[PDB]
Design an enzyme around this catalytic site. Structure first.
Site, PDB file in Angstrom:
ATOM      1  N   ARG A   1       0.825  -1.207   0.000  1.00 20.94           N
ATOM      2  CA  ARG A   1       0.000   0.000   0.000  1.00 20.94           C
ATOM      3  C   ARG A   1       0.856   1.252   0.000  1.00 20.94           C
ATOM      4  O   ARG A   1       1.458   1.633   1.010  1.00 20.94           O
ATOM      5  CB  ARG A   1      -0.950   0.011   1.216  1.00 20.94           C
ATOM      6  CG  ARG A   1      -2.205   0.869   1.010  1.00 20.94           C
ATOM      7  CD  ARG A   1      -3.358   0.483   1.959  1.00 20.94           C
ATOM      8  NE  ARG A   1      -3.117   0.886   3.348  1.00 20.94           N
ATOM      9  CZ  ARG A   1      -3.562   2.006   3.925  1.00 20.94           C
ATOM     10  NH1 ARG A   1      -4.299   2.891   3.257  1.00 20.94           N
ATOM     11  NH2 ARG A   1      -3.271   2.246   5.194  1.00 20.94           N
TER      12      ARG A   1
ATOM     13  N   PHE B   1       1.106  10.591   1.327  1.00 15.31           N
ATOM     14  CA  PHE B   1       0.740  10.068   2.639  1.00 15.31           C
ATOM     15  C   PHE B   1       1.838   9.154   3.206  1.00 15.31           C
ATOM     16  O   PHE B   1       2.545   9.536   4.141  1.00 15.31           O
ATOM     17  CB  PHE B   1      -0.623   9.346   2.546  1.00 15.31           C
ATOM     18  CG  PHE B   1      -1.118   8.756   3.856  1.00 15.31           C
ATOM     19  CD1 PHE B   1      -0.695   9.238   5.085  1.00 15.31           C
ATOM     20  CD2 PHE B   1      -2.045   7.733   3.842  1.00 15.31           C
ATOM     21  CE1 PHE B   1      -1.150   8.678   6.266  1.00 15.31           C
ATOM     22  CE2 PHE B   1      -2.513   7.183   5.020  1.00 15.31           C
ATOM     23  CZ  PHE B   1      -2.059   7.652   6.238  1.00 15.31           C
TER      24      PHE B   1
ATOM     25  N   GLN C   1       3.431   1.689   3.076  1.00 16.78           N
ATOM     26  CA  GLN C   1       3.199   0.641   4.064  1.00 16.78           C
ATOM     27  C   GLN C   1       3.692  -0.702   3.516  1.00 16.78           C
ATOM     28  O   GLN C   1       3.521  -0.987   2.337  1.00 16.78           O
ATOM     29  CB  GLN C   1       1.697   0.535   4.391  1.00 16.78           C
ATOM     30  CG  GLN C   1       1.386  -0.242   5.680  1.00 16.78           C
ATOM     31  CD  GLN C   1      -0.089  -0.348   5.952  1.00 16.78           C
ATOM     32  OE1 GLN C   1      -0.839   0.554   5.612  1.00 16.78           O
ATOM     33  NE2 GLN C   1      -0.521  -1.455   6.572  1.00 16.78           N
TER      34      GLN C   1
ATOM     35  N   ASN D   1      -1.362  -1.044  12.298  1.00 16.68           N
ATOM     36  CA  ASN D   1      -2.111  -1.908  13.201  1.00 16.68           C
ATOM     37  C   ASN D   1      -3.578  -1.971  12.814  1.00 16.68           C
ATOM     38  O   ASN D   1      -4.022  -1.245  11.937  1.00 16.68           O
ATOM     39  CB  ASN D   1      -1.982  -1.454  14.669  1.00 16.68           C
ATOM     40  CG  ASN D   1      -2.630  -0.082  14.940  1.00 16.68           C
ATOM     41  OD1 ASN D   1      -3.773   0.164  14.573  1.00 16.68           O
ATOM     42  ND2 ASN D   1      -1.893   0.792  15.600  1.00 16.68           N
TER      43      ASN D   1
ATOM     44  N   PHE E   1       4.764   1.533   8.444  1.00 14.31           N
ATOM     45  CA  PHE E   1       4.723   2.445   7.317  1.00 14.31           C
ATOM     46  C   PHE E   1       5.810   3.499   7.419  1.00 14.31           C
ATOM     47  O   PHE E   1       6.290   3.797   8.513  1.00 14.31           O
ATOM     48  CB  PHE E   1       3.325   3.074   7.107  1.00 14.31           C
ATOM     49  CG  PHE E   1       2.818   3.904   8.268  1.00 14.31           C
ATOM     50  CD1 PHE E   1       2.172   3.305   9.329  1.00 14.31           C
ATOM     51  CD2 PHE E   1       2.952   5.284   8.272  1.00 14.31           C
ATOM     52  CE1 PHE E   1       1.702   4.056  10.394  1.00 14.31           C
ATOM     53  CE2 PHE E   1       2.470   6.027   9.327  1.00 14.31           C
ATOM     54  CZ  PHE E   1       1.845   5.406  10.386  1.00 14.31           C
TER      55      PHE E   1
ATOM     56  N   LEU F   1      -2.145  10.659  13.627  1.00 10.17           N
ATOM     57  CA  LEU F   1      -1.853   9.270  13.994  1.00 10.17           C
ATOM     58  C   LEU F   1      -1.150   9.169  15.354  1.00 10.17           C
ATOM     59  O   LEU F   1      -0.940   8.071  15.876  1.00 10.17           O
ATOM     60  CB  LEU F   1      -1.043   8.598  12.872  1.00 10.17           C
ATOM     61  CG  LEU F   1      -1.767   8.556  11.509  1.00 10.17           C
ATOM     62  CD1 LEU F   1      -0.793   8.308  10.369  1.00 10.17           C
ATOM     63  CD2 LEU F   1      -2.876   7.516  11.501  1.00 10.17           C
TER      64      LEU F   1
ATOM     65  N   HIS G   1      -0.681   5.113  16.447  1.00 16.09           N
ATOM     66  CA  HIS G   1       0.380   4.252  15.905  1.00 16.09           C
ATOM     67  C   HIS G   1       1.700   4.561  16.633  1.00 16.09           C
ATOM     68  O   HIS G   1       2.037   5.732  16.817  1.00 16.09           O
ATOM     69  CB  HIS G   1       0.520   4.478  14.389  1.00 16.09           C
ATOM     70  CG  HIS G   1      -0.719   4.151  13.609  1.00 16.09           C
ATOM     71  ND1 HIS G   1      -0.963   2.898  13.088  1.00 16.09           N
ATOM     72  CD2 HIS G   1      -1.789   4.908  13.278  1.00 16.09           C
ATOM     73  CE1 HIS G   1      -2.128   2.900  12.464  1.00 16.09           C
ATOM     74  NE2 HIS G   1      -2.650   4.109  12.564  1.00 16.09           N
TER      75      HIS G   1
END
Ligand SMILES: CCOC(=O)CNC(=O)NCc1ccc(N)cc1
Length: 164
Positions: free
Chosen positions: A54, A59, A62, A101, A112, A121, A125
């Site tokens: 991903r 952004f 991952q 997660n 990521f 986040l 995370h």
């Protein structure tokens, strides 16, 4: 003295370049060790030959799902999953390395790399390292990802391990 680990990245088998990371074992020891161990492969499994499943430009990148290759898997050196160790460190900009997660205390192996500030986040995370060298290689990876994360070519960790 924080560990350094490296990823050698391939686009459809062909080399792209090397990303190295400082792992903040001084602040997130248990989480740093999981990533260090999985990068070296010393417990018999890890990131070597794994996918970046991903990639969302602007952004993050991952990966680390070395068991299902699609975001639904992975496992830690401590068992299938482990706690959120702490949230001391924050998603301050590009290059931040953080655990993906599926809810609270569900860390496995997926991580990521941030290509932007992702403040939202924080507290959600666990940040455990940052890109040390080869941010330009993470930006090159970025260009094979799409708005929904699907990659146009296969991005892999051709080789990984520890430098320091
Ligand atoms: C910007 C980071 O975005 C995520 O982390 C979205 N979550 C996500 O892909 N969850 C799938 C997942 C399943 C099992 C484990 N162990 C870890 C993750």
């Amino acid at each position: 003295v924080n560990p350094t680990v490296f990823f050698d990245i391939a686009v459809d088998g062909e080399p792209l370049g090397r990303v190295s990371f400082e792992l903040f074992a001084d602040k997130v020891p248990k989480t740093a060790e999981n990533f260090r161990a999985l990068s070296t492969g010393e417990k018999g499994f890890g990131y070597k030959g794994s996918c970046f499943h991903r990639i969302i430009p602007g952004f993050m990148c991952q990966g680390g799902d070395f068991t299902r290759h699609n975001g639904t898997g992975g496992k830690s050196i401590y068992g299938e999953k482990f706690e959120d160790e702490n949230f001391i460190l924050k998603h301050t900009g590009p290059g931040i390395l953080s655990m993906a997660n599926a809810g609270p205390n569900t860390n496995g192996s997926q991580f990521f790399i941030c290509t932007a500030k992702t403040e939202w986040l924080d507290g959600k995370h666990v940040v455990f390292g940052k890109v040390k060298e080869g941010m330009n290689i993470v930006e090159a990876m970025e260009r094979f990802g799409s708005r929904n994360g699907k990659t146009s070519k296969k991005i892999t960790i051709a080789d990984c391990g520890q430098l320091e």
